[PDB]
């Protein structure tokens, strides 16, 4: 009763090679499941994290290189445009010959970079307003500095778009870095040195004189301004409640409540909104509804922005854009980022040009590249198998509801209604393959020059920003996919109450119609469970069946949810990560993902037990003396065989909403009585604590 097919041998070999059978499963299941992978692998110089999951993404890039690198006579225009974009990206000799010239030509259109400009005040100061400077970077280039103004889905009215106002992102990974001491010192030093190195290159190319102490002074001031901005931003812990974050107001109300004084000029919110909205010919009045996500930040900004000049502000705003463009210029510019990249990621070199380029074209032409990907790598017939697995997991979730003692009957019924209403999206939208003309029309406005990579990326920025802004007066497209197909991930959209499983994730170790079902349920079954559970986590549960931010919970049901979920906050908050210098995980910021992981594991294992009931035991895998209940957990854990560079661990512990792979494995299995029974774990062994956190 042993499976001896080619497919079973490959599954068995992989499972055998990754594990360390000398480790006791109940002492450390991560080391038992992944110890062999850990002993055999070294993190590549270009990777900040490496493991089975990242390897899948590296392998998908290989497919993208194969389908983009060679022209074919049959190629439709949309495909021709993707391949021409790819060719401009990989031509490093044309890029190197242009030096920094494409940036120099762009600099006047953003009101220049004072430090790299002679007589800046004379040249731009006359026509400089914060309203115009912030809006220019936003509307034309998608660069959001000081004030993040965007068009997006209305949380309380999923069918429409609204303008949002939020705090902007920082140059460094999180606000924590701006402390600039201990584990953050190297990154702060590399960041300012990076500003200076770029200012020095620009000044050298423009043939301007260079005073080293003045470069140091000016860029240290950019850092002091940004440290004040960072300290004014709300921590992620204070942005986890979508009810508290949502503050709908009119432009009139914003002008009263959140006034600002910049360079001795009173900030006009109406002027700023119109400076952006005019780009796609939309006029705005004080009657326009605006969602303010950061009212506290706008309040703290008022005393900060009065202390700095037009010069100091433009030095930061322009740097925040330049930072991102330096990698698209000649080797000299690319080199200037080396220490900064090493401090944030630990990587000693940049990823292969073709990989960055395949990823860049995938990101900007997700439908054209998605089409090329699915034709080369995806079954399509497998879409139906995943459709069934989704139905089995959705059913289990609905069944689990009645077995929840902490939720009342009314909240159980409403949760069932939302669970029933979840729309699924599997593999790819059929249209990208079957409707060549719709695909050609999507990229109509794009015209790439094969020798002008920088101009192509600039065109992409304007196109992306114009497309998002013109959505304001439009209804949200129901058919629209929230992700391209050539993606190794899955998603949940709270606004559409939809789960998305791109072709990229529908492959081993997650899914194969040719691998054991114990592996399918432990892999993609668990991923399906994770995405459904996102509709019911600390964020998703605040959204209804139609995707609206509305409370469908009774006070006692909500209170009991918070109590059950507080266990996971403490459980994961107590994990200490050696690679991150002994720092604790943020149990609050990782809560949504930990609820989803714990919820998903339960639903997939129960759906797999239901499968064994209906179809009986599966044939055993050779060379593995484990049953299929054990193989389910083994596959589940092997998704996360991998490790992190310590620089990247410091980064991700602050920026990632997911717990690191090892803790997702340890954490979920510690809470699983089902795991402990499969591996016969003694009570209070590391993998089997007495207290187990449960929510779904
Ligand atoms: C680590 O786990 C402990 C135990 O669950 C957590 O301790 C609780 O902390 C809160 C807030 O300080 C107290 O009100 C509780 O009384 C504590 N409970 C116990 C049993 O001591 C602790 O918060 C967790 N640490 C992190 C960083 O999450
Ligand atoms: C958008 C994101 C998608 C999610 C898909 C997923 C969900 C759970 C598991 C998994 C399997 C076995 C054990 C535990 C968990 C694997 C994949 N991706 C990540 O979680 C990491 C991606 C990354 O690192 O970029 C989300 O929904 O959070
Ligand atoms: C790179 O661009 C230069 C200048 O246009 C051109 O001479 C060269 O052929 C290009 N290389 C490739 C491989 O396309
Ligand atoms: C950070 O912000 C708070 C609140 O606005 C302020 O009181 C404090 O002085 C700031 N700290 C630093 C280091 O800038
Ligand atoms: C914004 O204000 C400036 C003067 O402060 C003005 O020249 C410009 O036309 C205004 N833009 C819009 C769209 O109102
Ligand atoms: Zn998730």
Author numbering: 54 to 749
Excerpt from the paper describing this PDB structure:
It degrades a variety of vasoactive peptides such as atrial natriuretic peptide, brain natriuretic peptide, bradykinin, adrenomedullin and endothelin-15. The extracellular domain of NEP is comprised of two largely α-helical subdomains, with domain 1 predominantly containing C-terminal residues while domain 2 is formed mainly from the N-terminal half of the protein. The two domains are arranged to harbor a large cavity in the center that contains the catalytic machinery which is formed by residues from domain 1.
NEP in complex with LBQ657 crystallized in the orthorhombic space group P212121 with two copies in the asymmetric unit diffracting to 2.0 Å resolution. LBQ657 is bound to the active site of NEP by an intricate network of interactions that involves all functional groups of the compound giving rise to the high inhibitory potency of 5 nM12. The methyl group of LBQ657 is pointing towards the shallow S1 pocket making hydrophobic interactions with Phe544. It places the carboxylic acid in an ideal position for optimal interaction with Arg102 and Arg110, unique for LBQ657. When comparing our co-crystal structure to one with a compound harboring a benzyl in P1’8, an analogous induced fit of Trp693 towards the S2’ subsite is observed, which in turn leads to a conformational change of Phe106.
